[PDB]
């Protein structure tokens, strides 16, 4: 009975600051990988970032530019993302999803792919001049 | 009779993963499949090419057993002559394949409260594999067009990932142990028959 909720929707002129919060409830997995996927009307689905819960390593694309800061509150089991330098092509609906981890030869690797097991109601972000 | 080794593959404490399934060969003994057929421990048993009561009469040269563990929904999906997500990367069935699979639920045998499991299977691959082919390489798959110089991360995604079974999971996520029996006939005298 895993439930995901996304909050932090806001509309403002480019160049501001934005914050997104993903909260998960009823999670029975000790370790998981939590990722953000954005989708906009008229364009396909692509992943931007996803982090592992074992220690906190992150995987991201080339569009991050270092402005995406992601923190994992273990006490509240929350994912908090803060960003600046608003980009017009980043306006979309964001969905946060967690997937099971991967164990191999005593090492932890996370598979963070398009196919997903669970989904949640993401938040819409639209920024324009 | 002749001490057929059917009590070493079907009912064992540990089974290998799906991507590297356990392969065993059976021959040089006479067996009675009537007892095995009339077993309630098997979730499903139905296939083509032979009748359950005709197994004893017909003589086969070799038997190949491929044992592994798959999900509940993957039991119905796997079948010869069809294309699927798991069938195109881990286990392919020939069109003229002789034999079939036997699946049984083992939720009590293999269950954990939480954590990652030792079973691995692949989500991405370069292309389809030939039928009855086993792959052992665990190299990264270059999903993106731009090369990453062989560094784990974006566009060089790791294909293998675990199951994460749970006792409270649905009927489709239950751990199902599957053994595939294939009858192979060659230019050799038959070695397996019935009483
Ligand atoms: C192992 O399982 C088989 C079912 O295929 C059963 O016939 C056999 O008696 C079992 N062995 C033991 C020792 O329980």
Numbering used by the authors:
A (entry chain D): 1 to 52, 52A, 53 to 82, 82A, 82B, 82C, 83 to 100, 100A, ...
B (entry chain A): 333 to 527
Copy out sentences from the published article reporting this entry, exactly as the authors wrote them:
The SARS-CoV-2 spike protein binds the cellular receptor ACE2 and catalyzes membrane fusion. Conformational flexibility of the trimeric spike protein allows each of its receptor binding domains (RBDs) to exist in two major configurations: a “down” conformation that is thought to be less accessible to binding of most neutralizing antibodies (NAbs) and an “up” conformation that binds ACE2 and most NAbs to the RBD.
All structural analyses of VHH U and VHH E in complex with RBD were based on one of the two copies in the asymmetric unit with closer alignment to the localized reconstructions of VHH E with RBD and VHH VE with RBD using cryo-EM. VHH E employs its complementarity determining region (CDR) 1 and its unusually long CDR3 (22 amino acids) to bind the ACE2 binding site on the RBD. Of the 27 epitope residues that bind VHH E, 16 are also involved in ACE2 binding. However, VHH E and VHH V altered the abundance of spike-trimer conformational states, and the cryo-EM structures confirmed the binding modes as identified by macromolecular crystallography.
